[PDB]
Symmetry: C2
Subunit: 109 residues, 2 copies
Amino acid sequence: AQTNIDVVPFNVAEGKEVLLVVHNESQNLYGYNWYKGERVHANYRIIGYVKNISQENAPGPAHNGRETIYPNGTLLIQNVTHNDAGIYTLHVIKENLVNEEVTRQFYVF
Amino acid sequence: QTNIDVVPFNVAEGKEVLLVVHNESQNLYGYNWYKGERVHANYRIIGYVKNISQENAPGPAHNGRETIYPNGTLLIQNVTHNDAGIYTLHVIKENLVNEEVTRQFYVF
Ligand SMILES: [Cl-]
């Protein structure tokens, strides 16, 4: 994958904010979706973003209400809870549909 | 909401199979097929991009025998025993509220 993701901090205090920072400079991106877990599947979708409209899409079944997605794909989670800990998967949707999946994790203390 | 008919479900080696896609949606961006149960780049066969009316580049799971049509239908010719198994379609919507559909066929 071309996309890099840097989750900061890796261990987050309860009540604090976590960023899953996405670095992909490509000029041919269509958009993004984030999932909770290792799998790209609708049942685990959190939130996504469509670049040409500059808009978030509908919240997915896995959304906690505290996420914000940014136009470069980065995910913010505010006021983290213990249940937010675990595995996160970004699907980068390219205009040519040659897509990529990148999985990271963070934990909460 | 996406239906897929496997035609036929039990396939003779060396014959052809269709994964026939029925989806009436008017906000489709395109499609990708994968070998296996999961949407993952390492298993991608091929896709189709609607706004340019073209197949995209073959993926790692492409064997040179697979054709994708504009509605997402997949044709596999000259089927081998290795082609048998689980296939997953990822239906990409303009709003990125996407859908994953899995089917299977057997080879004899
Ligand atoms: Cl998890």
